[PDB]
Design a protein around this ligand. Structure first.
Ligand SMILES: Cc1ncc(C[n+]2csc(CCOP(=O)(O)OP(=O)(O)O)c2C)c(N)n1
Ligand SMILES: Cc1ncc(C[n+]2csc(CCOP(=O)(O)OP(=O)(O)O)c2C)c(N)n1
Ligand SMILES: Cc1ncc(C[n+]2csc(CCOP(=O)(O)OP(=O)(O)O)c2C)c(N)n1
Ligand SMILES: [Ca+2]
Ligand SMILES: [Ca+2]
Ligand SMILES: [Ca+2]
Ligand SMILES: [Ca+2]
Ligand SMILES: [Ca+2]
Ligand SMILES: [Ca+2]
Ligand SMILES: [Ca+2]
Ligand SMILES: [Cl-]
Ligand SMILES: [Cl-]
Ligand SMILES: [Cl-]
Ligand code: NA
Ligand code: NA
Ligand code: NA
Lengths: 525, 525, 525
């Protein structure tokens, strides 16, 4: 067998059937004779290729396979890899290299020092020392991306390798199963359960790896048994809990002092599936107040090591959430009462307040909608105003890197064809990966893109205002016609300058058979 | 003085007055109180920011300064850095880091292991160990980018550093001058000159560092004295010689065997300012034929070390070209005769042959036009059909990384406001950095963008056809309306479906007062 | 031809005829059929292998070739590589890798991520992508080590490559000549010469690259014409000037404030072949005083970029020293007067003062002796008390890394068989690379090793005393019998407990036909 044949067999035997790509000449010997059982999803720039694969992997809860062109294609994807690293996304990134005979002389399209290029944003990065090694290297890449803590990996392959003979012992790779589905040993788990049962005022904090594990329902059971309030850890890349459940208390502020103040009076704080903590603004103070102790359950040794406080347990989030949910006592305390609905903000017949937009989306969207957020000045409002009952209902760029939501929303919609995806994206953010719209049009992936157009980088302006920073350049982005950009890439486009038009545009988008972009005129910040 | 004040003084004292950027929160303390004598050029995505800075640096022959946001912004620029590395572009890339107090915990927007992120595509990469060190680190970055062989460098700065007190000894940095303007010692230069004077049939090969050095006119004198034919080294990022001078022989094919065959019968081949050689296709054979020896003059030790044949001298291209041009004898051989004009290809009243497009551009464009090429299947035609008399008249992505020409054409036009820039870009290539159009519109930088629309990745299809590679996915890019994309970003747009319309569109574009995009319907390959 | 045959031919054609090594199984296919015209120098640990090669390369002024075993052997050499980096030593370090078929599975003796292992202490680090590429990679390694600024490089080779067929085009590598023998262009050199001619009170500072270039005699002519005092730059790895010439002023103190004070009143300070500056102690103050400006000539862009003050020129030290020495005017100022001889320190009939040891070495050693220093608390005394008239007469660990002088002294003695090498090494320093003594015994390389035994890490104790640092552990090294260690490795050994015995021991050592170790009882600090 050829390296090509053997590698596609390994991929299908390991459950991979889709290649997200932007092709090039070093990759043609891989992509030729493309197997009939595989599908190729083209995007026009590599940040888009990786963003689409990333949303697809996060929503499908399985690895996604990517093929890019040498150094320049890999390099165009590195901002996307920064997000994938922080969201633990299992991405197998492959890139074609020059023929082995011309690497030394550095022919055009040589990826120099290739394994170093994507570092430090990958778990594993490698170029094989021979063609026959390629299937083994691919196997090692698949398992490195898929084992906890999941994350992106990188494999560089010289283009002449694909047609060479494969090692006949490569078949032992095809059906390997690798498990990291582990939980704390019985004795120490009994100790943890006793600490939770004994707490007078426990609190629970959940992060993105809960939603990645589909541990959401077990976390609901855990919170109900402990009669405990539940927050989402700051800078949240995913939504790990039903946002109108009585225990839910919302998104934590991303500040040291704000979080210790929030947790004051809670004797035991159980954090599951989050870093401790993804702070953002510098809000110095106590990490925890006297009387509070913290216990973190994380799938990632790096998270356990870097936490500035608390104990930690490194284990699988699905297995730990299920064990805790089923082992803890039912507390005799009263169940927390649900937060009230957010108030309607005053809205005239002109430009839309973001609050109005979220309230209208919540009123009209199906109950199993999936949202993506890249509208950076409106995140708090979004979290308060969208009832997200189900797992897999929210995605936000995990490293704060813009250019994620537009392509990711297409990958999520591909992963979840029966759940309407609605991406809410600022006018600034929309540009970073604008060309991803073309992939939605070409494959008829019916994502709805809601562009919040306020003319400025609003979160940055707000932050400049707080700093009393004067004379900062580059904060305004006037003069972009998003309906024309959508037309440019073949996507139906609508505009909403007021609430009447927003309602009508949403009704039309929701009944459409393809992707739709709605440009919404929102109030200046 | 503050680190902020001291660093802007160092920048202006070292000739830097423009910041190319896409801003973020880690950068606000740098960008605040932005000095009145500086200008900020915003672009909407970081590949565009760096591409614009890169064209500006290459055309101005001086370093360009860039400011990006942490890891995600740096990562979005890494494909652009792959080109900048291969073109020796002097780029000072700065990125903001989290406040020093939250780096350890990996707060959101921490650039982890920051100096490793852009490697291996930078000459130098660093994050200072203290705020007071920032001006010294910036000084070291400026000189590392600017010394031969020039190239991109990277500096990561924690956002809290800018407001701290600067080291009072930082003033010694402000006026430092560093020279790499060197040439081979007299004795060995005399030996080289004697070898050239003695050659029976010399040939000259010139690469991009000739145009970077503005050594073009000296190379003309050298070729006239030696009565030698002149080729441009393969995969050419720049044009180093007047393309209708009698000695000119065109772009070399990027193949080992093709080049040795081309050079057969030439006893001494003098290569100046090029790698030996930037081959592309794998065309195995002899590196040189018997009877040919090669001498390379390069500014880059890495080029001298990796050449598979020939002697080499590592020195400044400007100084060596001037010395050789002035020291060699006038040969009694006959001057080479000019190549004939290329023939007119048959053209009907329908879609345009690329040859027709280049002939029409050559007929109408000013004699001091500057061209950029990212129309990958038409490069040979372009080189044959455009008379480029002057230095600085051609740019092509030096690493083959698409997404260069559209933003670079804006930077070149900014650098050369009295030379009309015309970027010829394929419909595939146009998407990678499409949002750069907005910067042309906003700052009214009057670049003309000619989009060659044939609906496909034509160079890849052609290469697949040569490989007899069947069933390759992802080669077609139908359904893009480039006039709508131009409208989206505020750029006047025209379409040319036939020659009459191409002529009219060019006449209108050439008389326009702002940027213009022309979508040209070209023949399918 | 085989890769083995082709690679040894490339080595001999490039002037390499000696392999310094400690062998292993990954290297056996390289070392088998070892050519009759080559010689192999074994050392018992890899810090010793590299130290011996390093002294040999520095003294011979040509590259040295090293062969080590995989990761563990490379790793044992990395302290030695830290020194080689700072001394610009041209070392070609090769290490054997596992067979290509077992790299992926990480068999025992796989060098994982091999090219990253020696970074950041090498100029170039690589593992070839195929066996046929090995000769080209070796060629690129040879030129990278040998081009200015010279330095160590690293090549990892899978053991199965050596027996494979070589590329038939590899012969073009054999005779390549690469020159970096360059100097500043005429116009700017004329400007520099005029600045020197015009100076009222110039000073000259010389570093190790002067001695590496054998530019010492040209620097003498330059100093005589300018009638200028000459200092050696701080932390000196080599001696660049005759130490009893009338212009000589000694080793500069390694402190910022001390150096600006020393240079006060000098209007132009010309630094040649040194970093600006290799400070050591933290002695904050002005980098230069008002009235002093600095001009650095360096072969190393990194040195020019990082200097905190002055102008710089990046060029070959040999070519620049020769041009300056021959172009400057003879000043009418009076020639500097020679420093007086150092005084005799009072010495009783007991333990030796280091001053007594150096005075006695100076009295008895031949005028063309070569000294090495790794007696860290006595460096100033050594520089004052040894008349070193000739180039290549002094070596000190360029990164301050102990374990250099003992092996390096053996390599220097191998390079200079007619100059008596005398290594003066502290009792602490002697242990780091003690096993190197065996190589001197086995090959009868007649180095003399003078062990200064004061029982303590004296420089560290002194520094602790200055810091008023109490209760520092680990400063004493009692209970080492260096005559027994010398006997252990086959080297004749002598002891000197007083001056009578020191004189007798030196007389015996100087007349010996093999290596000799003298253990000298020196005064406690
Ligand atoms: C790749 C990248 N570049 C720059 C930034 C810095 N940044 C954070 S928020 C923001 C503005 C986003 O503007 P927009 O999408 O319009 O939303 P708004 O803040 O107006 O709600 C920017 C530029 C970033 N996070 N990522
Ligand atoms: C960043 C990047 N991604 C992918 C490629 C691979 N590639 C080389 S040429 C090419 C097609 C360019 O198509 P187009 O601009 O339409 O020009 P044409 O070949 O049709 O003349 C592609 C995708 C590349 N060189 N750079
Ligand atoms: C490899 C290495 N380890 C540790 C040190 C730290 N160090 C510098 S000087 C010194 C002591 C040297 O003692 P010795 O050789 O006896 O000379 P003395 O200071 O007594 O003159 C030490 C341990 C070093 N420079 N290099
Ligand atoms: Ca409602
Ligand atoms: Ca906005
Ligand atoms: Ca990297
Ligand atoms: Ca014409
Ligand atoms: Ca095309
Ligand atoms: Ca004496
Ligand atoms: Ca000692
Ligand atoms: Cl157990
Ligand atoms: Cl000279
Ligand atoms: Cl000159
Ligand atoms: Na190479
Ligand atoms: Na950390
Ligand atoms: Na492996």
């Amino acid at each position: 067998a050829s390296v090509h044949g053997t590698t596609y067999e390994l991929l299908r035997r390991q459950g991979i059937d889709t290649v997200f790509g932007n092709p090039g000449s070093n990759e043609l010997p891989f992509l030729k004779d493309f197997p009939e059982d595989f599908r190729y999803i083209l995007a026009l720039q590599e940040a888009c290729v990786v963003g689409i694969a990333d949303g697809y992997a996060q929503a499908s809860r399985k690895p996604a396979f990517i093929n890019l062109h040498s150094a320049a294609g890999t390099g165009n994807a590195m901002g996307a890899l920064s997000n994938a690293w922080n969201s633990h996304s299992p991405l197998i990134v492959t890139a074609g290299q020059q023929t082995r005979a011309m690497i030394g002389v550095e022919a055009l399209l040589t990826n120099v020092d290739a394994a170093n290029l994507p570092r430090p944003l990958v778990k594993w990065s490698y170029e094989p020392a021979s063609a026959a090694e390629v299937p083994h290297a691919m196997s090692e890449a698949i398992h490195m991306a898929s084992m906890a803590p999941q994350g992106p990996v990188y494999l560089s392959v010289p283009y002449d390798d694909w047609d060479k003979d494969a090692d006949p012992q490569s078949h032992h790779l095809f059906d390997r199963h690798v498990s990291s589905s582990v939980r704390l040993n019985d004795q120490d788990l009994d100790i943890l359960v006793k600490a939770l049962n004994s707490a007078s005022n426990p609190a629970i904090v959940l992060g993105p790896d809960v939603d990645a594990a589909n541990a959401n329902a077990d976390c609901v059971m855990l919170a109900e048994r402990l009669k405990a309030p539940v927050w989402v850890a700051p800078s949240a890349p995913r939504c790990p809990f039903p946002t109108r459940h009585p225990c839910f208390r919302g998104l934590m502020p991303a500040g040291i002092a704000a979080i210790s103040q929030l947790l004051e009076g809670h004797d035991v704080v159980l954090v599951i599936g989050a870093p401790v903590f993804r702070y953002h603004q510098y809000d110095p103070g106590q990490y925890l107040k006297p009387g509070t102790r913290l216990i973190s359950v994380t799938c990632d040794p790096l998270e356990a090591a870097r936490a500035p406080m608390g104990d930690a347990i490194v284990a699988d989030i699905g297995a730990m959430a299920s064990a805790l949910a089923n082992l803890v006592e039912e507390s005799s305390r009263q169940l927390p009462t649900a937060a009230p609905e957010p108030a309607k903000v005053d809205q005239d017949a002109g430009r839309l307040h973001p609050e109005t937009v979220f309230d209208t989306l919540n009123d009209m969207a199906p109950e199993n909608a999936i949202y993506l957020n890249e509208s950076t000045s409106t995140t708090a409002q979004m979290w308060q105003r969208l009832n997200m009952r189900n797992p897999g209902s929210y995605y936000f760029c995990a490293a704060g890197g813009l250019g994620f939501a537009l392509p990711a929303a297409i990958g999520v919609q591909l992963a979840e064809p029966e759940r309407q995806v609605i991406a809410v994206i600022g006018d600034g953010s929309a540009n970073y990966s604008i060309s991803a719209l073309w992939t939605a049009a070409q494959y008829n992936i019916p994502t709805i893109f809601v562009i919040m157009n306020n003319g400025t980088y609003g979160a940055l302006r707000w932050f400049a205002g707080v700093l009393e920073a004067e004379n900062v350049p580059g904060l305004d982005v006037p003069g972009i016609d998003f309906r024309a950009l959508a037309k440019g890439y073949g996507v139906q486009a609508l505009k909403a300058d007021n609430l009447e038009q927003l309602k009508g545009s949403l009704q039309e988008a929701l009944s459409a058979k393809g992707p739709v972009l709605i440009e919404v005129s929102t109030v200046s910040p």
